[PDB]
Design a protein around this ligand. Structure first.
Ligand SMILES: [Mg+2]
Ligand SMILES: [Mg+2]
Ligand SMILES: [Mg+2]
Ligand SMILES: [Mg+2]
Ligand SMILES: [Mg+2]
Ligand SMILES: [Mg+2]
Ligand SMILES: [Mg+2]
Ligand SMILES: [Mg+2]
Ligand SMILES: [Mg+2]
Ligand SMILES: [Mg+2]
Ligand SMILES: [Mg+2]
Ligand SMILES: [Mg+2]
Ligand SMILES: [Mg+2]
Ligand SMILES: [Mg+2]
Ligand SMILES: [Mg+2]
Ligand SMILES: [Mg+2]
Ligand SMILES: [Mg+2]
Ligand SMILES: [Mg+2]
Ligand SMILES: [Mg+2]
Ligand SMILES: [Mg+2]
Ligand SMILES: [Mg+2]
Ligand SMILES: [Mg+2]
Ligand SMILES: [Mg+2]
Ligand SMILES: [Mg+2]
Ligand SMILES: [Mg+2]
Ligand SMILES: [Mg+2]
Ligand SMILES: [Mg+2]
Ligand SMILES: [Zn+2]
Lengths: 203, 158, 50, 122, 86, 118
RNA sequence: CGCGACCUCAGAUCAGACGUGGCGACCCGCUGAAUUUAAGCAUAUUAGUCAGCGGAGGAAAAGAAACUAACCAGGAUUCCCUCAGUAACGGCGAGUGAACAGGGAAGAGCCCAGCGCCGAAUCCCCGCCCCGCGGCGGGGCGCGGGAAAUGUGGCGUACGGA
C-alpha cells in the first residue's frame, strides 16, 4: 500500500524534499489565521493512525501555538517570598504545546469533541497542529457502534481533563517503577491515598 | 523538649491531616452491601458457582514465597492447547484465560492440564435449548442433580 | 429626586405598600406568633439602603 | 350555575368563547361593585368567577393543544412545545435502537460463542 | 475637616441596583457589578467567601423549575400518560 | 471585466428567506392583555367624581403595560363610547391612572350611572 | 474573452442539530503561596497544600504491560491489611518517605490504522407506501441529491493473521 511509503516519507524530515515542504507549509500556515479549518488533512496517514476516517462529521482544525516556555504572570519581579520561588523566566509549563493546541480547539468548539492531534510544522515563534474534532451528534457517528462512545456524555471535553494523548503524556501515568507517583487514579489520587489516616473502629 | 529516656520518634502529623481522616464507620454497612451483592450474583447465575471460574495452580515468584501455591489469574494458551480446549470456548464454559502467562516448567504445565481434565469431567454442561439437546451435553439425570458449589471451585490445597 | 426612573419608582412603590401594618384579624387565628409588624420602616430611621 | 370542566369539553369553541366573554363581563361588574362598595356575596362571588375563567381557559387550551399534537403526531418534525419535555441530559442521549446497534464482528462473536449455562459437581 | 464636614458632600451615587443579582452593587463608572460580575457571562463566586456562598445558592431562592424536576424524577419522568378516568 | 475601484469589497451574494419545515412553537400565544384585563376598575374617589361631573371624563385604573391607544380602544370596545383623549399617569401605588376625556355628545354622568359608579 | 470542472475562501433570518450558564460534597487537568517548623534563617518544611482557573459524571480517573521480578517465576485496572515509618531523600539537620511480593473485595475483555483480499461490496439527506409513532425506528419502491479512491464497509491486531 501507499501508506507505508507516505509514512517513512514523513519520517525522513531532514532530506531536501521534506525540508522544502516543511518550509513552504510552515510559511503558508503562518500567513493563515491562528485558528482555522483544514478541509482535508495535511498528514492523512497520521490522521488515520490517530483515528480520523473520511466521513461526514469528522472535522480537522489547523491551529497555531506560540512557541516557548511559560513565564510567571507577576509584576516586574516581585514574587513575595523565599528565594526558591523568585524564578520567573526559566519556568516551564507542565503540559505540552500539543495539548495546549487540543484544549484551545476544544474551547473554541464545545460541540465538537477532540479525538487527538498531530504536528505539521514549526517556526521559531510558532508550532502548528491539526486537531481532529468529531461530532457526537451527527448520524454517521451516532449510528456507528465503533465510535458511539464519543456520543456518550462521559467524554465531554477530554481536552481539559487530559484524556487525549497529548494530555495523557503530560500526566505522567503508566505502569512500573518509573510511575510510582501516579499509582491509583492519578497523581492527585496517589497523594490523597497516601496522605490519609486509616483510623479504624477497633484499631 | 525530650525527657530522661525514650525512643526517638518522627510523628507524621505536620501536615493538615484532620481534613483527610477516613473514618471506618461504613465498615459493617459495607459488609452487608458486599454480602447482598454476592447473594445477588449467586441468584443471578443460578447453576453456576458463586465464586467464579477456576484459577490455576500457581507457583510464587520472589524466593521468600516460592514454596507456597496460589490461585492464579488464568490458564495459559499452551495449557489450553495441550488439554484441547479453545480459548473462546473456555471463557464461555467458565474457565479463566489469560494470554500473558508462559510455561517454562513442564510439571506445572502437566498439573494445569490435569486440572483441566478434571474440570472437564466435573463440568455439567446444560443444553442451549431444553427441548432439543445437542451432542456435547450432559444427561437428564445430571440436569436435576446439578447445583451450585459453595466457596472456591476446586480449592487449591498446598 | 423628582427626576425618577420607572425601575426606581417601582422599587419605591413596592416598599410603600410593604410599609403598612398588620390587620386586626390576623392575631385571632390559632397558631399566631405575630403581635405586630416588625418590619415597619420609617423614612427617618432606615434610609432604604441605596 | 356551577361551571364544571366536564361539560365544557364537549361543547364548541365559539360557545366557550361566548361563556368566557360573559364571565369577563361578570368579573368586571363584580370589580366595579367591589370598588363602589358591594355585598359580601359579590366579594365571595368574584373568586368563583376567577376560577370559572381559569377552568374555561384551561379547557380551551386542552382542546387546542391535544388537537395540535393529533395533527403533528404523524409528521416526523413536530414543534418544540409538542416534543417531549424531559431533562436535557436525557434528551441528549442515544436512541433505543442505537443502544442496540452492535457491530458485525460483535454479532459474530455473540453467535459463535454464547455464554453457556453450566454447573459443577461437588 | 475630613469627617463631619466632609460627609456633607456625599450626594452623587456610584453603585445602583443590579438587574441579575438584585443587590445594590452595580458600579456606574466601571459599568460592572461588584457582587456577581454582570457583564461577565459567569457568576462571580469564590471559595474564600464561604459565607457569601450560602447567601446565594440553589437552596436559597424559589427553585420553581428544580422542585418539579425532583417531582418528575421521583416517578421516573413519565410524559403524556394519563391516569385511569372514572 | 475591468476593476474600476482599487478596493475589493465583498460581492453581493444571494440569500434566501425563512422557509421553515415546522414552526418553533405549536400555537401562537393568545393576547393576555385583553380589553377586560387591561381595565381593572374605575375610581370612586370624591375628587374623581368631581372630575367626572365637571370635566366630562372618566377615571379608570389600568395595568401599567398599556398604551393610550390601548386604553382608548378598550373603552370604545367595552362601554361603546367615543373618546376625545386619554391622559395617563402612574401612581405611587404602581397602577396607571387614566383620565379618559370623552366626546361631548355622550354624558360622563350618564355613562357613570350606566356602569354603576356614583 | 466566454463556458465547464477541481482546490482554497466567503455570504446566508437557508433546511436540520449542538455548545454557552448553574451546582460543585466526591473526581480530572493546570496554576499555586505565605503563616509554621528548623527554638534565628536562606536549602528544606508547611506543600502540589490554601486561594485562583477550566471540565464532567452518578461516580470520575485508571485499565488490559514498551509490567514486576531474577524465583520451581508471577500476570489488566481500582480499594483494604501488611510491606513500613522500611528502602531511600534531607544545612544527612528539622523532618520527608514509596514500591515489589503475600492475604483479600472485585474480576471481563477488546477494537482500529498499517499489512493484504473483495466490481464502494460503505455512509448521510430528501419524495411515496405499510407498521409504530411521549427515547422518530424497520422493510420496500426512486436513470433522486450528496459524502467517499487524498479510502467507507466485511475478514483481520501481536494471544498471530490471511
Ligand atoms: Mg523555603
Ligand atoms: Mg507543577
Ligand atoms: Mg479511558
Ligand atoms: Mg516522554
Ligand atoms: Mg519537664
Ligand atoms: Mg518518659
Ligand atoms: Mg474472590
Ligand atoms: Mg438623615
Ligand atoms: Mg472491522
Ligand atoms: Mg465614581
Ligand atoms: Mg465559574
Ligand atoms: Mg436556518
Ligand atoms: Mg459548565
Ligand atoms: Mg522558625
Ligand atoms: Mg520560635
Ligand atoms: Mg524570625
Ligand atoms: Mg512539596
Ligand atoms: Mg483549591
Ligand atoms: Mg449530572
Ligand atoms: Mg471512565
Ligand atoms: Mg501490581
Ligand atoms: Mg514493623
Ligand atoms: Mg548537620
Ligand atoms: Mg513531601
Ligand atoms: Mg502487591
Ligand atoms: Mg480498510
Ligand atoms: Mg495488547
Ligand atoms: Zn449583579
Amino acid at each position: 500500500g501507499a501508506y507505508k511509503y507516505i509514512q517513512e516519507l514523513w519520517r525522513k524530515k531532514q532530506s531536501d524534499v521534506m525540508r522544502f515542504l516543511l518550509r513552504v507549509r510552515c510559511w503558508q500556515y503562518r500567513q493563515l489565521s491562528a485558528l482555522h479549518r483544514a478541509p482535508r488533512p495535511t498528514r492523512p496517514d497520521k490522521a488515520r493512525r490517530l483515528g480520523y476516517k473520511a466521513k461526514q462529521g469528522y472535522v480537522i482544525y489547523r491551529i497555531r501555538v506560540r512557541r516557548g516556555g511559560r513565564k510567571r504572570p507577576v509584576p516586574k519581579g516581585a514574587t513575595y517570598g523565599k528565594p526558591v520561588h523568585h524564578g520567573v523566566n526559566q519556568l516551564k509549563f507542565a503540559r505540552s504545546l500539543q495539548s495546549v493546541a487540543e484544549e484551545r480547539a476544544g474551547r473554541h468548539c464545545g460541540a465538537l469533541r477532540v479525538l487527538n492531534s498531530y504536528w505539521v510544522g514549526e517556526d521559531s515563534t510558532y508550532k502548528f497542529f491539526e486537531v481532529i474534532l468529531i461530532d457526537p451528534f451527527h448520524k454517521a457517528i451516532r449510528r456507528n457502534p465503533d465510535t458511539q462512545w464519543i456520543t456518550k456524555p462521559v467524554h465531554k471535553h477530554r481536552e481539559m481533563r487530559g484524556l487525549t494523548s497529548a494530555g495523557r503524556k503530560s500526566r505522567g501515568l503508566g505502569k512500573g517503577h518509573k510511575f510510582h507517583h501516579t499509582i491509583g487514579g492519578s497523581r492527585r489520587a496517589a497523594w490523597r491515598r497516601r496522605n490519609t489516616l486509616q483510623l479504624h473502629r477497633y484499631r | 523538649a525530650p525527657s530522661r529516656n525514650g525512643m526517638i520518634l518522627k510523628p507524621h502529623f505536620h501536615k493538615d491531616w484532620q481534613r483527610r481522616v477516613a473514618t471506618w464507620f461504613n465498615q459493617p454497612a459495607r459488609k452487608i452491601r458486599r454480602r447482598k451483592a454476592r447473594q445477588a450474583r449467586a441468584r443471578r447465575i443460578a447453576p453456576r458457582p458463586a465464586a467464579g471460574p477456576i484459577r490455576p495452580i500457581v507457583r510464587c515468584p520472589t524466593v521468600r514465597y516460592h514454596t507456597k501455591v496460589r490461585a492464579g489469574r488464568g490458564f495459559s494458551l499452551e495449557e489450553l492447547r495441550v488439554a484441547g480446549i479453545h480459548k473462546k470456548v473456555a471463557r464461555t464454559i467458565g474457565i479463566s484465560v489469560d494470554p500473558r502467562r508462559r510455561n517454562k516448567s513442564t510439571e506445572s504445565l502437566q498439573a494445569n492440564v490435569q486440572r483441566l481434565k478434571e474440570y472437564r469431567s466435573k463440568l455439567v454442561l446444560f443444553p442451549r435449548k431444553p427441548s432439543a439437546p445437542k451432542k456435547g451435553d450432559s444427561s437428564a439425570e445430571e440436569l436435576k442433580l446439578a447445583t451450585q458449589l459453595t466457596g472456591p471451585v476446586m480449592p487449591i490445597r498446598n | 429626586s423628582s427626576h425618577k426612573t420607572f425601575r426606581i419608582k417601582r422599587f419605591l412603590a413596592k416598599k410603600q405598600k410593604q410599609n403598612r401594618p398588620i390587620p386586626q384579624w390576623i392575631w385571632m387565628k390559632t397558631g399566631n406568633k405575630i403581635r405586630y409588624n416588625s418590619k415597619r420602616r420609617h423614612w427617618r430611621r432606615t434610609k432604604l439602603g441605596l | 350555575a356551577k361551571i364544571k370542566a366536564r361539560d365544557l369539553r364537549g361543547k364548541k369553541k365559539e360557545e366557550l368563547l361566548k361563556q368566557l366573554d360573559d364571565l369577563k363581563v361578570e368579573l368586571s361588574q363584580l370589580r366595579v361593585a367591589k370598588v363602589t362598595g358591594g355585598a359580601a356575596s359579590k366579594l365571595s362571588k368574584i373568586r368563583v368567577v376567577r376560577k370559572s375563567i381559569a377552568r374555561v381557559l384551561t379547557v380551551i387550551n386542552q382542546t387546542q393543544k391535544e388537537n395540535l399534537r393529533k395533527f403533528y403526531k404523524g409528521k416526523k418534525y413536530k414543534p418544540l412545545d409538542l416534543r417531549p419535555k424531559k431533562t436535557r441530559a436525557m434528551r441528549r442521549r442515544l436512541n433505543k435502537h442505537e443502544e442496540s446497534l452492535k457491530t458485525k464482528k460483535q454479532q459474530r462473536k455473540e453467535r459463535l460463542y454464547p455464554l453457556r449455562k453450566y454447573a459443577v459437581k461437588a | 475637616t475630613k469627617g463631619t464636614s466632609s460627609f456633607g458632600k456625599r450626594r452623587n451615587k456610584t453603585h445602583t441596583l443590579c438587574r441579575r443579582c438584585g443587590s445594590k452593587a452595580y458600579h456606574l463608572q466601571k459599568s460592572t457589578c461588584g457582587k456577581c460580575g454582570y457583564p461577565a457571562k459567569r457568576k462571580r463566586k469564590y471559595n474564600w467567601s464561604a459565607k457569601a456562598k450560602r447567601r446565594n445558592t440553589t437552596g436559597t431562592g424559589r427553585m420553581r423549575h428544580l422542585k418539579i424536576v425532583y417531582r418528575r424524577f421521583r416517578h421516573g419522568f413519565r410524559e403524556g400518560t394519563t391516569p385511569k378516568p372514572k | 471585466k475591468i476593476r474600476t475601484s482599487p478596493t475589493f469589497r465583498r460581492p453581493k451574494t444571494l440569500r434566501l428567506r425563512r422557509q421553515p419545515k415546522y414552526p418553533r412553537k405549536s400555537a401562537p400565544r393568545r393576547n393576555k392583555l385583553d380589553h377586560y384585563a387591561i381595565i381593572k376598575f374605575p375610581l370612586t374617589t370624591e375628587s374623581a367624581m368631581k372630575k367626572i361631573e365637571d370635566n366630562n371624563t372618566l377615571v379608570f385604573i389600568v395595568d401599567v403595560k398599556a398604551n393610550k391607544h390601548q386604553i382608548k380602544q378598550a373603552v370604545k370596545k367595552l362601554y361603546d363610547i367615543d373618546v376625545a383623549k386619554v391622559n395617563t399617569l402612574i401612581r405611587p401605588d404602581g397602577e396607571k391612572k387614566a383620565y379618559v376625556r370623552l366626546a361631548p355628545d355622550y354624558d360622563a354622568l350618564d355613562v357613570a350611572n350606566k356602569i354603576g359608579i356614583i
